[PDB]
Amino acid sequence: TSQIVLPPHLERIRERLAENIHELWVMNKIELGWQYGPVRDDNKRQHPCLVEFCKLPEQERNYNLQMSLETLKTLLALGCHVGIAYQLTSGYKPAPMDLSFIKLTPSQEAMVDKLAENAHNVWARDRIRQRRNPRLVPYTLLDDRTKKSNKDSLREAVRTLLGYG
């Protein structure tokens, strides 16, 4: 996917979808009960990467930025075209829109499945350097129980792409 020059006409959309992925990375943790703390912990139910997008430094926004780039590049590589068409937290207000109403077509569902397969392949190729975790198998050879979580995580990119027009 990285062999595709990213068109700057939709860099603003790649940043909107990056901000959306970041705000949902806040959303799920706050559903689990995570606040905004200055210590990078997981058992202390706090996360220092929940603040507004503009205040996020280069050490915290690159994850969502690269995630958006790779999903869009995977879309363009597969062949379809991209173009023109509450729980009170501890300081942040993640609420883009009601993006869970319009039914997502089976083509987009398979597209999100392919995105999850690619992301899992990258993560497994990174993980093989460590021992012998049962998740070192490809996504096609992965247990079906956790397949839906990765497909759900990748569904929001195409959901934002469709909803924003």
Coordinates of N, CA and C in Angstrom, one line a residue, residues 7-61:
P7 N -2.8 11.4 -2.7 CA -3.2 12.6 -3.3 C -3.6 13.7 -2.2
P8 N -3.0 14.9 -2.3 CA -3.3 15.9 -1.3 C -4.7 16.4 -1.3
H9 N -5.5 16.2 -2.4 CA -6.9 16.6 -2.4 C -7.7 16.1 -1.3
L10 N -7.4 14.9 -0.8 CA -8.1 14.2 0.3 C -7.2 14.1 1.5
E11 N -6.1 14.9 1.7 CA -5.4 14.9 2.9 C -6.2 15.4 4.1
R12 N -7.1 16.4 3.8 CA -8.0 16.9 4.8 C -8.9 15.8 5.3
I13 N -9.3 14.9 4.4 CA -10.2 13.8 4.8 C -9.4 12.7 5.5
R14 N -8.1 12.5 5.1 CA -7.3 11.6 5.9 C -7.0 12.1 7.3
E15 N -7.1 13.4 7.5 CA -6.9 14.0 8.8 C -8.2 13.9 9.6
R16 N -9.3 14.1 8.9 CA -10.6 14.0 9.6 C -10.8 12.6 10.1
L17 N -10.5 11.6 9.2 CA -10.6 10.2 9.6 C -9.6 9.8 10.7
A18 N -8.4 10.4 10.6 CA -7.4 10.2 11.7 C -7.9 10.7 13.0
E19 N -8.5 11.9 13.0 CA -9.1 12.4 14.3 C -10.2 11.6 14.7
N20 N -11.0 11.0 13.8 CA -12.1 10.1 14.2 C -11.6 8.8 14.8
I21 N -10.5 8.2 14.2 CA -9.9 7.0 14.8 C -9.4 7.3 16.2
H22 N -8.8 8.5 16.3 CA -8.2 8.9 17.7 C -9.4 9.1 18.7
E23 N -10.4 9.8 18.3 CA -11.5 10.0 19.3 C -12.2 8.7 19.6
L24 N -12.3 7.7 18.7 CA -12.8 6.4 19.1 C -11.8 5.6 19.9
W25 N -10.5 5.8 19.7 CA -9.5 5.2 20.6 C -9.7 5.8 22.0
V26 N -10.2 7.0 22.1 CA -10.6 7.6 23.4 C -11.9 6.9 23.8
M27 N -12.8 6.8 22.9 CA -14.2 6.4 23.2 C -14.2 5.0 23.9
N28 N -13.6 4.0 23.3 CA -13.6 2.7 23.9 C -13.0 2.6 25.2
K29 N -11.9 3.3 25.4 CA -11.2 3.3 26.7 C -12.1 4.0 27.8
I30 N -12.8 5.0 27.4 CA -13.7 5.6 28.4 C -14.9 4.8 28.7
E31 N -15.4 4.0 27.7 CA -16.4 3.1 28.0 C -15.9 2.0 29.0
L32 N -14.7 1.6 28.8 CA -14.1 0.7 29.9 C -13.8 1.5 31.2
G33 N -13.7 2.8 31.1 CA -13.6 3.6 32.4 C -12.3 4.3 32.6
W34 N -11.7 4.7 31.5 CA -10.3 5.3 31.5 C -10.5 6.8 31.5
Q35 N -9.8 7.5 32.4 CA -9.7 8.9 32.5 C -8.5 9.4 31.8
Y36 N -8.2 10.7 31.9 CA -7.0 11.4 31.3 C -6.0 11.7 32.4
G37 N -4.9 10.8 32.4 CA -3.9 11.0 33.4 C -2.5 11.2 32.7
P38 N -1.6 11.7 33.5 CA -0.2 12.0 32.9 C 0.7 10.8 32.9
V39 N 0.3 9.6 33.4 CA 1.1 8.4 33.4 C 0.5 7.4 32.4
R40 N 1.4 6.9 31.5 CA 1.0 6.0 30.5 C 0.8 4.6 31.2
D41 N -0.4 4.3 31.7 CA -0.7 3.0 32.3 C -1.9 2.4 31.7
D42 N -2.1 1.2 31.9 CA -3.3 0.4 31.5 C -4.2 -0.1 32.6
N43 N -3.6 -0.4 33.8 CA -4.3 -0.9 34.9 C -4.8 0.3 35.8
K44 N -4.3 1.5 35.6 CA -4.7 2.6 36.4 C -5.8 3.4 35.7
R45 N -6.5 2.8 34.7 CA -7.6 3.3 33.9 C -7.4 4.8 33.6
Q46 N -6.3 5.1 33.0 CA -6.0 6.4 32.5 C -5.2 6.4 31.2
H47 N -5.3 7.4 30.4 CA -4.6 7.5 29.2 C -4.2 8.9 28.8
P48 N -2.9 9.2 28.6 CA -2.5 10.6 28.2 C -2.7 11.0 26.8
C49 N -3.4 10.1 26.0 CA -3.6 10.4 24.5 C -5.1 10.6 24.2
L50 N -5.8 11.3 25.1 CA -7.2 11.5 25.0 C -7.5 13.0 24.8
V51 N -6.6 13.9 24.7 CA -6.8 15.3 24.6 C -7.1 15.7 23.2
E52 N -7.6 16.9 22.9 CA -8.0 17.4 21.6 C -6.9 17.2 20.6
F53 N -7.3 17.0 19.3 CA -6.4 16.7 18.2 C -5.3 17.7 18.1
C54 N -5.7 19.0 18.2 CA -4.7 20.0 17.9 C -3.5 20.0 19.0
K55 N -3.9 19.7 20.2 CA -2.9 19.7 21.3 C -2.0 18.4 21.2
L56 N -2.4 17.4 20.5 CA -1.6 16.2 20.4 C -0.3 16.5 19.7
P57 N 0.8 16.0 20.2 CA 2.1 16.2 19.6 C 2.3 15.2 18.5
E58 N 3.5 15.3 17.8 CA 3.9 14.4 16.8 C 4.2 13.0 17.3
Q59 N 4.3 12.9 18.7 CA 4.6 11.6 19.3 C 3.3 10.8 19.6
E60 N 2.1 11.4 19.3 CA 0.8 10.8 19.6 C -0.2 10.7 18.5
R61 N 0.0 11.6 17.4 CA -0.9 11.6 16.3 C -0.5 10.7 15.2

